[PDB]
Amino acid sequence: AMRLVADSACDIKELRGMVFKAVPLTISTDNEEFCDDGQLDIHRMLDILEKHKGRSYTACPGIDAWLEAFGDDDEIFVVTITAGMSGTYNSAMAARAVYLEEHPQAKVRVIDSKSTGPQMRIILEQLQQMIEEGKKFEEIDGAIDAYMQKTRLFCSLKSLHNLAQNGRVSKVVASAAEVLGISVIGTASSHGTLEAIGKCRGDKKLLVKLQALLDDAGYEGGKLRICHVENEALADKIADMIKQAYGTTDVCVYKAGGLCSYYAERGGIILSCETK
Numbered sequence: 001a002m003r004l005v006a007d008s009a010c011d012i013k014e015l016r017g018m019v020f021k022a023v024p025l026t027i028s029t030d031n032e033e034f035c036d037d038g039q040l041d042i043h044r045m046l047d048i049l050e051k052h053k054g055r056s057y058t059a060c061p062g063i064d065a066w067l068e069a070f071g072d073d074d075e076i077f078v079v080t081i082t083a084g085m086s087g088t089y090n091s092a093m094a095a096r097a098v099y100l101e102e103h104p105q106a107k108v109r110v111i112d113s114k115s116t117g118p119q120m121r122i123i124l125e126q127l128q129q130m131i132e133e134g135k136k137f138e139e140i141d142g143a144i145d146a147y148m149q150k151t152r153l154f155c156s157l158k159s160l161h162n163l164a165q166n167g168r169v170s171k172v173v174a175s176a177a178e179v180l181g182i183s184v185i186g187t188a189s190s191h192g193t194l195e196a197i198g199k200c201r202g203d204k205k206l207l208v209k210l211q212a213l214l215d216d217a218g219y220e221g222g223k224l225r226i227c228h229v230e231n232e233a234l235a236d237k238i239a240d241m242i243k244q245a246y247g248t249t250d251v252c253v254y255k256a257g258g259l260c261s262y263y264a265e266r267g268g269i270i271l272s273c274e275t276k
C-alpha cells in the first residue's frame, strides 16, 4: 500500500515493485530552465553549461509539486537531499504540513538523507525491502534511521565549478580540480555536507584510494550503488575493483540525473555503500 517519494537528486524515476514518485528540482541559467524530469536531455544541458559564461542556479521543488507527488496515499516516506546543502528538506516539510491538514488519516515521514544520489537510492531500496517484508509504518519509520548510520557516500569530481559558484564547497577545495587530470575525492560528512578527502591524479590512483576509504569505513561487501555523469568507464572499473576485493554481488552502476549531473559535472562519479 505505502508510497515512496524522493526528490530528483536520487537519480531514479521508478522502483520496480513499489509505488514511487520522483519530484524534480530545476537547474536554470538567465536564459533557460532545465527541469530534472523524464523530458530532460542532460547531454545537451551539459553542453550548454560548458560554454555558458554566466551564473547558473538550482531550485528545490515547489510545495505544489510535492503535493502532486504525494497523491492521496495515507502512508508516505519522502527521501530528500541533505538539509545541510539544500532547501529541499524544508520544502518537503512544508508540503507535509499542508498534506496533513488535507488528509486526516495520513502518516508522512520526511527523511533528510544527509546525502545525495546513490545514498538516497540505498535508503529508498531499504524502505522498499522493509515494506515487502511486511513491516508496519511505525517500525519502518524508526528502523530506517538506524540503517542509515551503516551507509556511506564517496565521490570523485573532475570539476567543482558549479558547487563552488553556488557556495556549496570552498574555493580552495574547488581549485584543486581546476588542474587538468586532477579529481577531488569527497565524502558526505556527519553534517550532511561535502567533506573533501583529497585530490587524485587518474583512475588507477582513485581505485586505490577508494579501496582504502572503504576498508576504513567498514565496508564488507554489502549493497553498492554507483552513479556517473558520462563516465560509465570509470564507474565500471570501480565496480570491478570492489567485486574483486570484497566479494560484492549486489552492485548497480547507472546514470546520474539532472541535478547530480549539474553538481558532480561531466566525468564525475558518486558511490554509496552499506557498511558493517
Ligand SMILES: CCCCCCCCCCCCCCCCC(=O)O
Residues within 6 Å of the ligand: 025, 057, 058, 059, 060, 081, 082, 085, 086, 087, 088, 114, 115, 116, 117, 153, 155, 168, 186, 187, 188, 189, 192, 193, 194, 195, 259, 260, 263, 264, 270
Ligand atoms: C552530502 C553529499 C556530498 C556529495 C556531493 C556530490 C555532488 C552531488 C550533488 C550535491 C547537491 C548539493 C546541492 C543541491 C542544491 C539543490 C537546491 O538548489 O536546493
Ligand code: NA
Residues within 6 Å of the ligand: 157, 158, 159, 176, 177, 178, 179, 180, 181, 182, 183
Ligand atoms: Na580536474
